[PDB]
RNA sequence: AGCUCUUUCUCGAUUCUGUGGGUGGUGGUGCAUGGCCGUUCUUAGUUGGUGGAGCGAUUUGUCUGGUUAAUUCCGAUAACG
């Protein structure tokens, strides 16, 4: 990766990726998502490479580190699956969540009381949260998000591929994201098991 | 009706007369106007701020749907209050 094997993907994490079905990706493709895919099966389903997922995780996370204030890396998700995941993210690591409906004009107003000026964004799924992306390009925000095979790239600077159609793929990926930023900034580093797990970043899932 | 005329007393600077200038008018103009009233209109309509969309006139907000006597609420939502 960069450093020889003290940042490179371990044998452990491979099991978690495959158990959460992150490697699988939808039938439809884009021409900006061609390189991330390796190939197709004998059936409609296209298998994302996990090596290529891993490199994109790192500089994405390293950019979340690079800011000197952790209270203005505003995360956003509006899908139900991505509500519980982001809430733990921005609770654990200093960040600002915007859960549910966006309520437009919150990055360009001077009258609204939910007005904020962050630096980064971390979005789940471009085609549920298209609204904050358009407003990001009016006030110079860097942008990161989780793309799928059929999610187009536009007003995003870096992608973090994932299966993310509402799965354990979602919560696992947000957990891993918060794990990495702590290895560089925090004192959680040792790279041997963290107390917090991905078993509460997964969906609410209506119970009995 | 001393209004006028005949008649011949009375009042005393308040006046009369000329010019300049006022004043009054249910005189005109409601197509010069104020105010008031009627009517469009007894229906549910109306507007600005900041942001968004347009070269602009403008538009969004002030709504597909459900609901109410009612722009009355629920809900939706590039609009928010």
UniProtKB/Swiss-Prot annotation:
- Covalent cross-link site, Glycyl lysine isopeptide (Lys-Gly) (interchain with G-Cter in SUMO2): 88
Q: Which GO terms describe its biological process?
A: ribosomal small subunit assembly; translation
Q: Where in the cell is it found?
A: Cell membrane; Cytoplasm; Nucleus
Q: Which domain of life is it from?
A: Eukaryota
Instruction: Please give the residue positions where the record annotates the modification Phosphothreonine.
Output: 96
Q: Which residues carry this modification: Phosphoserine?
A: 42
Query: Chief location of this protein?
Result: membrane
Record site: Cleavage: 114-115, 132-133
Any signal peptide, and if so, which residues? none
| Protein name (Swiss-Prot/TrEMBL) | Small ribosomal subunit protein uS2
Organism of origin is Oryctolagus cuniculus (Rabbit)
- Location of this fragment in the whole protein: 2 to 209 of 295
């Amino acid at each position: 990766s960069g450093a020889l094997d003290v940042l490179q993907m371990k044998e452990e994490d491979v099991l978690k990726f495959l158990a959460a079905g992150t490697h699988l990706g939808g039938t439809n493709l884009d021409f900006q998502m061609e390189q991330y895919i390796y190939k197709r099966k004998s059936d409609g389903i296209y298998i994302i490479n996990l090596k290529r997922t891993w490199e994109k995780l790192l500089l994405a996370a390293r950019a979340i580190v690079a800011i000197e204030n952790p209270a203005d890396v505003s995360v956003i998700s509006s899908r139900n699956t991505g509500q519980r995941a982001v809430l733990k993210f921005a609770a654990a690591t200093g960040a600002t969540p915007i859960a549910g409906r966006f309520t437009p004009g919150t990055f360009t107003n001077q009258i609204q009381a939910a007005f904020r000026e962050p630096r980064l964004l971390v979005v789940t799924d471009p085609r549920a949260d298209h609204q904050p992306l358009t407003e990001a390009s009016y006030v110079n925000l860097p942008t990161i998000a989780l793309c799928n095979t059929d999610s187009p790239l536009r007003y995003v600077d870096i992608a973090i591929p994932c299966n993310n159609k509402g799965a354990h793929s979602v919560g696992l990926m947000w957990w891993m994201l918060a794990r990495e930023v702590l290895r560089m900034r925090g004192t959680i580093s040792r790279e041997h098991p963290w107390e917090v797990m991905p078993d509460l970043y997964f969906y609410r899932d209506p119970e009995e």
